[PDB]
Design a protein around this nucleic acid. Structure first.
Ligand SMILES: [Zn+2]
Lengths: 57, 55, 95, 104, 225
RNA sequence: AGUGGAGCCUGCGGCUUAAUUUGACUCAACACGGGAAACCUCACCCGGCCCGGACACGGACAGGAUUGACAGAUUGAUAGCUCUUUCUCGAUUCCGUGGGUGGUGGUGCAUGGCCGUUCUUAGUUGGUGGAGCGAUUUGUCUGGUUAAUCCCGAUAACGAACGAGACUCUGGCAUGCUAACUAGUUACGCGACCGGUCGGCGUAACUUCUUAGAGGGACAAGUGGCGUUCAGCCACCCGAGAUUGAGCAAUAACAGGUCUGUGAUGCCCUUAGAUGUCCGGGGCUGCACGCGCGCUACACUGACUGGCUCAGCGUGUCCUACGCCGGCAGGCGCGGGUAACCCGUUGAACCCCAUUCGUGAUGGGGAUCGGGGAUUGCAAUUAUUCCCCAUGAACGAGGAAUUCCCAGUAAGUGCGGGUCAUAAGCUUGCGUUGAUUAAGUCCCUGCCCUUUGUACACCGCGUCGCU
């Protein structure tokens, strides 16, 4: 996610720009098991800043 | 003003229906990715939102 | 502003102690007062009428007024709606 | 003490099972309390008789210690280009012969 | 149908910005440090970091109730899904976000600028930092706006280290004459995080372990073990 | 390669205008204020609407304080805006005294923050020790060395810290590792066509191609010269690379820009025929003329047409595929995609082959102008755009002067994003094609740096007049 912006909040300077970036990494991990196991695996190792999406069938 | 004629102009099309969610100013708005933030209040909250000037 | 809106706003105030706005005069109505047809301009100004009376505190952040109830403001709604004192607001229920 | 290229004495360290012992982990917090020296004295109105107390513990008007602390506090209201130091953290009894020169 | 991942992560950081701004607005005079939002589908737990937790809790725990109900009513997500938890900072002096709001209150209380700046300065120098600086700018002693600068210890002004060692925190204080700006740059130390300091050292310091003094050869000895 | 010579766009001046808001004026303003403005924007002008005047005092008010209002008159306006019409509404108030709010209203020479500039430099500063009463000095150099006060070595100095460097992101390399039905190949089978082709179909592997994480790799490493034979400098082997491009950027500063980005802001001005809010219209774009970027060209190394054939950032709940009607612009239906799943194997342009045009202001080049068509929008009048005929003008390489650039560079060429209801001649990025010269200097200019002297001296403004 790349957003370029002017540094100057009035537009008087030497036309200097900030290239702000967000980097999003995506992971896909697949299992083949009944749905009660994936819940107890996911729910224990909860870590902030990393989030989990669970799709069933 | 009069009730029937105070907001009689529709406010869906035109940049006057779009204001920054921080400073309510409408010049220099970043609508990319749905920030809707002013370009001058963006440099204030860039570090807090999760933006890093890597390169 | 009519008194129907004045009573409709005051009913929500005591049971929770929290109430917000969007600072939009041309807003048609306030979303919290659902099925009441109370425009938010009347809400924000009639609520501001209690700011100068010392019953509430302002805390403004990003186009949204935020308010609390003073201990002296609790009794100001107990005689307008004539709420008898054995009922408590949202502050005194848990813990 | 502050060099980048540094030496490590790890091999000479003998025994360290519990490194985070609760002796060096003292929580030093004195700012928001009333124990910080960097706080106003809440000044008393000026006595008319010129002294406080009686007997041998009569604290007089100028009272060189008190007047020195007062002159330090009056230094704290100087020009922004002036540099003072840490004159309240260390007890600085500064006299008028010196303070008036610095004020000039 | 849900929000796209780009706008999912943009709108997540804006929620972390408005809440932080509001908590600063309210608890500027309470020692508020920061916000840690941990997202749990049952209830999202917002841990507030403050200096004195009894002030933000208040008597009986009444102040945080208004806060959690306001954030219930404002951000649209349903009630029974947010849990506020006020907690003390691991090191109050070392965190410059909580510290820079203390000097603002000290100036607002009527102190002379230089004395309170030395108070904050020596408190955070004794707190354990390798170096710190405070820059207060404005109309200090006149209609002419001079600048005041207190530097001691070390500082790293350039290089990736300036992203995770110094803790820049700018604040505005409102006096009778006008507005004074306060910058407090506290550099974090080494000794990896037992609640203090980042893990990796400064990307220049090399420390060399002295050798174990080995046995010099005297006689070829064959010992069966 | 241009610019300055033409045409056009845009910005700044002047000239007009009711207003043609506004700031910025060598580099360090002039396609800048994300400032490509139908309303809004909008500050400006011409006119209306409302209190959205909190709170305190006094007066009015229930035998009404009032609000809203159909029909007609007025009115651009189902503008009770006012009059007639008399219906509503139950203190939600009104009138003055106080002072609060709202200001894109004044001061960037009262300010914060941010940004720009000196400077993308080459410095800045302690501790201990030596000298001097002290100001002060050595350290911070004779010399050599480098992009670097970067380093060597002398040495009353020894050691440091900030800056530079290190760092972080990106690029070139891994047939070693990790593992892919939301990526790809091979094999087999199924076909389809004439042992070859299939982006045409499915399961076995598999990670070379594609992804993106760890680890590795490059250090003046090795060799030959130069060297105060130290520090390091030229040349060569091997290697993917003997090395790219950015981010961050010290001490000390500037009356540099911003109150017009903020519910940042001190003194304020105004506050009910308002400098507050909203609405209608206009204007910011108006044109004798001047000054800066930028875009098209001046034709043959070209233009037209047909055919051929390759990307990369990177958006998208609006992006769009496919089918049908239309000459285009467009319109209809049915789909997918909240996303390496769909648009898309992103059949992009320049370029490659063939035809025609052959030095002609020529078919080069399309400024100006008429007519029609479609879309977006309440509203295209000041042509918003896009499409089709027609009109075809200056311009034939540009005076003085001037800008930028060393290798996937300059130039040529198109794609994406920002602005966007409608939109790029701007700008931020991205690939594609791909050079010439030099690898050296103070000749211009600018900035340094060392030494020596060093804290506006003198000779060359008058005549007359009365009290
Ligand atoms: Zn934003």
């Amino acid at each position: 996610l790349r957003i370029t912006t002017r540094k100057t909040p009035c537009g008087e300077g030497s036309k200097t720009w900030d290239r702000f970036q967000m980097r999003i990494h995506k992971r896909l991990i697949d299992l083949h098991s009944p749905s009660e196991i994936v819940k107890q695996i996911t729910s224990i190792s909860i870590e902030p800043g990393v989030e989990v999406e669970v799709t069933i069938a | 003003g009069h009730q029937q004629l105070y907001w009689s102009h529709p406010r869906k099309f035109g940049q006057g229906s779009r204001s920054c969610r921080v400073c309510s100013n409408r010049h220099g708005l970043i609508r990319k990715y749905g920030l809707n933030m002013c370009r001058q209040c963006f440099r204030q909250y860039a570090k807090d939102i999760g933006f890093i000037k890597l390169d | 502003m009519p008194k129907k809106n004045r009573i409709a706003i005051y009913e929500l105030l005591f049971k929770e102690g929290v109430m917000v706005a969007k600072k939009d005069v041309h807003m048609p109505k306030h979303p919290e007062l659902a099925d009441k047809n109370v425009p938010n301009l009347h809400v924000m100004k009639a609520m501001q009428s209690l700011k100068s009376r010392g019953y509430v505190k302002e805390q403004f952040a990003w186009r949204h007024f935020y308010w609390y109830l003073t201990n002296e403001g609790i009794q100001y709604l107990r005689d307008y709606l004539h709420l008898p004192p054995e009922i408590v607001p949202a502050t005194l229920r848990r813990s | 003490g502050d060099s980048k290229v540094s030496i490590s004495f790890e091999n000479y360290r003998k025994v360290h099972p519990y490194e985070d012992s609760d002796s060096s982990e003292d929580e030093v917090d004195w700012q928001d309390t009333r124990d910080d020296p960097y706080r106003p004295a809440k000044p008393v109105p000026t006595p008319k008789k010129g002294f406080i107390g009686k007997g041998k513990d009569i604290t007089t008007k100028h009272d060189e210690v008190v007047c020195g602390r007062k002159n330090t506090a009056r230094m704290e209201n100087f020009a922004p280009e002036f540099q003072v130091g840490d004159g309240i953290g260390m007890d600085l009894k500064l006299s008028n012969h010196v303070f008036n020169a610095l004020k000039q | 149908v849900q929000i796209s991942k780009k706008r999912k992560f943009v709108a997540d950081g804006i929620f972390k910005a408005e809440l932080n701004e509001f908590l600063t607005r309210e608890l500027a005079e309470d020692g508020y440090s920061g916000v840690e939002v941990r997202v749990t589908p049952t209830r999202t737990e917002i841990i507030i970091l403050a200096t004195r937790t009894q002030n933000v809790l208040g008597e009986k725990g009444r102040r945080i109730r208004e806060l959690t109900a306001v954030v219930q009513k404002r951000f649209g997500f349903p009630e029974g899904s947010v849990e506020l938890y006020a907690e003390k900072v691991a090191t109050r002096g070392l965190c410059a976000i909580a510290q820079a709001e203390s000097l603002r209150y000290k100036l607002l209380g009527g102190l002379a600028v230089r004395r309170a700046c030395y108070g904050v300065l020596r408190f955070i120098m004794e707190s354990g930092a390798k170096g710190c600086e405070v820059v207060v700018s404005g109309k200090l002693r006149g209609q002419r706006a001079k600048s005041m600068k207190f530097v001691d210890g070390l500082m790293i002004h350039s290089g990736d280290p300036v992203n995770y060692y110094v803790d820049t925190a700018v604040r505005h204080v409102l006096l009778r004459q006008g507005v004074l700006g306060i910058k407090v740059k506290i550099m974090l130390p080494w000794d990896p995080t037992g609640k203090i300091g980042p893990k990796k050292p400064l990307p220049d310091h090399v420390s060399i372990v002295e050798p174990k003094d080995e046995i010099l050869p005297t006689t070829p000895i064959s010992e069966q073990k």
